[PDB]
Amino acid sequence: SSIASSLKTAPVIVWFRKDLRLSDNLALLAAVEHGGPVIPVYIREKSAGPLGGAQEWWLHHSLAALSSSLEKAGGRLVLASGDAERILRDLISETGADTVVWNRRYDPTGMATDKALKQKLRDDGLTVRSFSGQLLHEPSRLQTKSGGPYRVYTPFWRALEGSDEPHAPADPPKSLTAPKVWPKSEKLSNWKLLPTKPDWAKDFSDIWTPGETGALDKLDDFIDGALKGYEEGRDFPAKPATSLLSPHLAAGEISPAAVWHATKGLSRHIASNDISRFRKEIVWREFCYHLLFHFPELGEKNWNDSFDAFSWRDDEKSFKAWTRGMTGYPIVDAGMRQLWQHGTMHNRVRMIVASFLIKHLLIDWRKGEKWFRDTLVDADPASNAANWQWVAGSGADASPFFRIFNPILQGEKFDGDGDYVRRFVPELEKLERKYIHKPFEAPKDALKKAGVELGKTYPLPIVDHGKARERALAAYAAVKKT
Ligand SMILES: Cc1cc2nc3c(=O)[nH]c(=O)nc-3n(C[C@H](O)[C@H](O)[C@H](O)COP(=O)(O)OP(=O)(O)OC[C@H]3O[C@@H](n4cnc5c(N)ncnc54)[C@H](O)[C@@H]3O)c2cc1C
Numbered sequence: 001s002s003i004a005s006s007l008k009t010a011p012v013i014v015w016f017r018k019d020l021r022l023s024d025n026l027a028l029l030a031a032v033e034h035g036g037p038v039i040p041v042y043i044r045e046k047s048a049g050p051l052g053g054a055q056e057w058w059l060h061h062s063l064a065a066l067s068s069s070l071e072k073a074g075g076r077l078v079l080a081s082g083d084a085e086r087i088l089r090d091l092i093s094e095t096g097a098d099t100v101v102w103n104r105r106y107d108p109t110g111m112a113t114d115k116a117l118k119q120k121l122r123d124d125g126l127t128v129r130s131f132s133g134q135l136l137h138e139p140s141r142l143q144t145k146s147g148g149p150y151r152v153y154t155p156f157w158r159a160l161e162g163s164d165e166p167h168a169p170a171d172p173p174k175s176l177t178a179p180k181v182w183p184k185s186e187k188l189s190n191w192k193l194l195p196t197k198p199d200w201a202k203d204f205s206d207i208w209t210p211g212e213t214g215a216l217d218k219l220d221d222f223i224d225g226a227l228k229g230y231e232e233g234r235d236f237p238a239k240p241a242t243s244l245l246s247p248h249l250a251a252g253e254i255s256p257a258a259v260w261h262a263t264k265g266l267s268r269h270i271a272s273n274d275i276s277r278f279r280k281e282i283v284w285r286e287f288c289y290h291l292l293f294h295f296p297e298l299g300e301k302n303w304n305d306s307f308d309a310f311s312w313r314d315d316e317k318s319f320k321a322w323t324r325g326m327t328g329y330p331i332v333d334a335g336m337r338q339l340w341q342h343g344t345m346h347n348r349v350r351m352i353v354a355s356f357l358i359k360h361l362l363i364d365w366r367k368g369e370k371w372f373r374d375t376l377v378d379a380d381p382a383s384n385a386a387n388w389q390w391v392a393g394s395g396a397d398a399s400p401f402f403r404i405f406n407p408i409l410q411g412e413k414f415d416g417d418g419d420y421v422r423r424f425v426p427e428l429e430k431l432e433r434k435y436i437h438k439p440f441e442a443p444k445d446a447l448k449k450a451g452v453e454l455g456k457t458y459p460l461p462i463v464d465h466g467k468a469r470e471r472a473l474a475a476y477a478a479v480k481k482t
């Protein structure tokens with residue numbers, strides 16, 4: 001190291017955010033190609049990070065898993081809290097790194113943070129490079145054949161379906177070059193991301209294994225499992241027919257290109273309709289990000305400003321009943337209880353509970369959006385906002401506001417035998433399917449036999465369907481006169 005000294009390569013910093021994976025990670029691969037020591041860092045920023053309590057549980061386990069995977073490769077994960085610029089400059093100064101890399105994040109606030117930071121670092125002569133991976137498409141570049149943003153799903157789907165296959169996923173690096181001396185790291189346990197007493201996430205582990213290995217296990221199981229019959233099965237919440245990839249995708253533990261490529265070459269065993277339908281759902285995520293790019297206020301302002309003057313009820317009591325799954329409408333209650341217990345909800349039931357809040361209770365959709373932000377492990381700044389707005393009646397793909405279905409009928413249509421309701425509202429277990437979705441219409445004899453006392457065992461409906469419907473349509477008529 002004195003007289004036969006090779007000229008050494010400077011380190012490179014890899015800044016992880018919602019891309020907590022080693023596979024199909026172009027930033028990490030760039031760091032490997034760069035040579036020299038690789039310095040992985042995760043920063044607890046003020047603005048960005050987990051959208052709520054459930055996602056903090058997710059993040060803890062995700063960071064623990066990523067750290068373990070990096071250590072297996074010979075690296076480590078540096079943890080730091082505070083101002084990203086100050087932290088990165090301090091790491092640069094300490095290590096002598098000449099480059100910072102990251103994977104692009106496409107939520108407008110995070111993208112703006114990155115743009116500003118990138119310019120500041122470049123102005124001081126640092127190399128900064130950002131990479132695709134979070135999305136199959138580039139929202140700032142993709143336009144209709146006539147030069148517009150996509151406003152409607154089907155043409156957007158046809159564009160992505162018709163595009164050259166997303167590039168196949170890149171392998172993870174098996175080894176990372178480490179610095180001789182590691183920068184100091186914060187302790188994950190000190191970040192207070194986990195519940196303590198009570199452990200309200202105690203059943204999350206029954207469903208979830210956060211991190212890249214868990215993501216790949218979910219993908220593998222889906223391809224070898226529920227992908228078969230997915231198209232027919234996905235509408236029925238009692239059936240475990242979906243992939244459960246959403247929080248892994250949200251956390252960037254698996255790329256959508258990896259998911260897409262996993263659906264290729266399956267014709268010997270899998271019907272094309274199931275694959276097409278699953279791909280469409282992946283593209284719904286893409287579309288939500290497209291809309292967020294084109295309308296950054298998607299989570300706070302109505303897409304259709306005709307709704308701005310809508311007069312929402314000031315009824316925090318009904319809102320609380322909704323959050324607790326105590327509406328007296330079993331399918332709604334089942335969904336809200338599923339969410340509380342497992343940090344997720346079947347998509348059909350998300351639509352039903354969202355509609356119940358907005359139309360039956362006439363409560364501001366933003367309140368429902370915020371509740372979901374705190375309780376979903378998959379909370380996503382594009383998909384949550386976009387879906388709430390569609391249920392609320394804004395957007396080309398929105399159901400018109402005046403379309404108001406009875407939760408009872410939706411329950412009987414998509415959960416006819418009542419298995420989903422019985423799973424999450426077990427106090428109704430003994431009711432026959434005739435009354436499982438409408439226990440308030442059952443006769444005294446049946447309620448007695450099933451061990452159900454309305455108002456004790458299970459609540460009466462907090463609103464009458466007919467009256468709620470009249471109220472919502474009157475509110476719709478009023479907003480038109482504005
Ligand atoms: C009111 C409301 C709020 C929602 N909030 C979120 C959210 O915060 N995060 C989130 O990822 N999804 C959200 N969704 C969409 C959808 O309900 C979930 O993606 C789905 O329940 C996830 O289960 P899965 O992974 O088994 O889906 P699968 O059926 O296996 O679908 C595969 C993937 O496609 C994507 N996807 C599927 N459906 C949709 C959709 N309607 N919109 C956008 N992406 C979709 C997801 O990434 C999902 O993992 C919301 C839907 C509604 C109606």
Ligand SMILES: Nc1nc(=O)c2c([nH]1)NC[C@@H]1CN(c3ccc(C(=O)N[C@@H](CCC(=O)O)C(=O)O)cc3)CN21
Pocket residue numbers: 052053054197198200201339340341342343344374375376
């Ligand atoms: N999906 C999901 N499920 C949840 O249960 C959940 C979320 N998400 N997101 C965050 C909130 C907050 N969590 C909490 C936090 C504290 C208490 C708690 O301290 N409970 C006391 C009594 C006070 C009370 O219930 O408010 C207890 O020991 O029962 C309960 C739930 C549950 N949370």
